[model samples]
Target: HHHTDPMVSKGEELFTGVVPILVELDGDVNGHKFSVSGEGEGDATYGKLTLKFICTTGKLPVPWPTLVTTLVLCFSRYPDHMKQHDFFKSAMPEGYVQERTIFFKDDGNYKTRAEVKFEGDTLVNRIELKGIDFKEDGNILGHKLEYNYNSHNVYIMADKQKNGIKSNFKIRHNIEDGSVQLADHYQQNTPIGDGPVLLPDNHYLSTQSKLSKDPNEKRDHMVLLEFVTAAGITLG
Candidate 1:
């Protein structure tokens, strides 16, 4: 059965947290490296979640491309409830094995295939990049990423070859705030390295927003971190 919470006011802060600022660089920028040493705060409430980032190192480019757009594009890679239902329906008749392909047009135009398998009530999803028409090397094409999910928790395995680390983690889905938190304990299998690891104790990713009565008042802000020096001075 589904559950519901009390309705919040038009403008109320539902959740807030200090999160890491991860940026995926491309082209000639640092040779297409990913920068992840920065930190920021995300304030989410009624209409939108405002994410403000401050890079401790003064290396980020000025007038860089918007971070919120990339975040939204990456967010679409995750499987939602509707997509799950569609997968379940497609796999139900084929012995719980379904492969669905999707073409994404964000950041770069790429094609990906999602293969879903159901073991009882749990869903095992595997996403693989199929093809792309980008200027980059396209080495990520055909790379596979996998995750297991249920009603309560999501299990994400870490690959040292790709992520430069080997530590599996669990995420708990909070029904109230509709946010996922790094779980403190392992409910199923014992983790790889440490028994169970929490990336950040308070870091969370939530996107629960209330509908505004006035359509024109609704606006969404993206995640853009300002490069700053160690002395808290903003960089150009």
Candidate 2:
């Protein structure tokens, strides 16, 4: 396995309180070459609230379709609605609901509706991605992707079986470290028995942040993320 240098990106302030960030990387790992890219915008005032994110990747299993498709669908539908003005407009008032219809990428272009709202100290977001078909490996696959996220954690139900079993996944926030951990449970009620396994051997994923300290430079945040597979190849 060959590892590349870590890729880095800086957050550009869209306005006083909104910042957009992007990162892309590629490398060889576990005898396979892979690439990953992530882009997102956040509100600095709202405890770095993630306004939206679109992460794309090749190879390396991590529920890629559900994770990217869900967010991408949201991005495509409510492109302008998630702006700073809209965020505050809906967030300032209690119980204000903002909803949009997301059209899937297909010949017929099926659609789904999603909703977002702010209640007290929590932000409730919900979307049900069902009945839509995605093409992978020249085969059509239907998804039962449903995800719910508040202030605490994000829970995603990627797929469901005819017997009513579902593939459950969770992204838990670590407040102290400002990081998130992804966990997978075969069934909805199954307990997360252990920490997530890394990429194998010394391969792992980590992030580092650097804040501008020089007075001459405007305040900027640089984030370097490393997805190290064999030989310490890293991508940010």
Candidate 3:
């Protein structure tokens, strides 16, 4: 009977926030051209839940469904515990198949966490993570993942990573009407290639994925990349 009384505060909100900075491929997936132009970013809103447990502690099992809910208490923190936190909150509710967990270290604390949630419909593994004090200050943030069930595309990272890669997800079929539009971000000046790629220096990969407005036009897979230096990029 060791239950900890941890004071926890939480908040939730839904907003459309996926940034598609690179338009890798643009063609006809069943004659539907996606929107591939000018920082073609994605569109969708999601419920963002933020939580903070006041200085408290407890213990649970190594894996998921196990958590530390506590009041002014103390318990040793580890990697699995944090990973399970994000998994229990997101994956379980959506009934997503679990892939695996990833951990990053800082100041002797395995604080940064990431895990993939597999979607059988389109066969995409979405990454879920939470960062405490990850930004300028001690700000709490997490990844926003939205799925395009029709096209098997997993959207992650609103902006490009530090490496300068723009394309964030993968799709077997071209983006039709519903796929999220990507954006051209960062001053990296990364030139766009025939498909999704990261440029050398100072360029933003821009592209759009949208449904055709005209009734007569067979939907075109209208995605395009804009760089000369080329290499293949993959997202899971």
Candidate 4:
């Protein structure tokens, strides 16, 4: 698969007291094993994170970007999402809270905001992205994304009603191992050929494990990998 622009280019340097993170996902897409690994150490010296993905057993033909989409589940910081995987059993910040962080801008201009709320045990995360263009009166498009997480699962849904585009899919996670599957959209799969290469919507697995219980080892404490798409088809 030809590589696309890595999304981490928009983030800034790590601030004090921020925890470093790493996640790896593994599973089968069309029955061929696929894997992705992502890690970040407080922005690194260059103020960007590094993520890499590779497809194994692909001594075969497959849609490449679709394999990359699976990497979307990789995490550099659960705190960035204000929601951690259930396997961690770590409680989220209680009550309604809003956090804003600035990322590095080529011309010094951008803002990102996050709001986390709770309904009993369920946590809702809302994030806003905004940027000002370099040209006088120039403005970059801004939009918000939402996700819900609970004791049993966590999910994100994108719909045309609000986003003007529907990129919908849900993932099931294996709490015991930190593995995940695209699960369901309960609505749509983002589609295959005519649509945005939708994940067959099943069997995307990842293994999660702790490197150390000590907070001092935060960077290596937890990691997960996105490995594959099930049914021998990357886009199903």
> Best-fitting candidate, measured by TM-score?
2
Best-first order by TM-score: 2, 4, 1, 3
Which residue runs does candidate 2 get wrong by more than 4 Å?
1-42, 46-91, 95-110, 135-236
* Model 2 residue pairs with clashes: 3-233, 4-233
Show model 4 residue runs off by greater than 4 Å. Answer: 1-20, 38-48, 56-61, 72-236
lDDT of 1: 0.23
Q: What TM-score, computed on C-alpha atoms, does each candidate reach?
A: 0.23, 0.26, 0.15, 0.23
Worst 10 residues of 2 by lDDT: 5-14
Per-residue lDDT over 41-106 for candidate 4, one digit per residue giving the tens place of the 0 to 100 score: 322121233332233333312222212223222122333222211111111222222222222222
lDDT of 2 by residue, 1-236 (tens): 11131110011111234445333433232223334444455343232323222223433322233233222111111112122111222222122222222233231122222333333433343433333333442111222222222222222231222211122233332222343333232222111112111111222112112221224523222222111111122334
What's the residue-level lDDT of 234 in candidate 4?
Answer: 38
Candidate lDDT scores, in order, read 0.23, 0.26, 0.19, 0.26
Q: Rate residue 209 of model 1 by lDDT.
A: 23
Candidate 3 stretches with Cα past 4 Å from truth are 1-152, 155-163, 166-168, 174-210, 213-236
Candidate 3 structure quality by residue, lDDT tens digits, 1-236? 11131111010011123323221112121222222212232222221111111111121101110011100000111122121122112221122222211221220111111121212321122222221223221111111112121212222222234322222232222123433322211111111122232112222112222222234534322122111111123223
Q: In model 3, what lDDT does residue 2 have?
A: 17
What is the full ranking by lDDT, best candidate first? 4, 2, 1, 3
Steric collisions counted per model: 0, 2, 48, 20
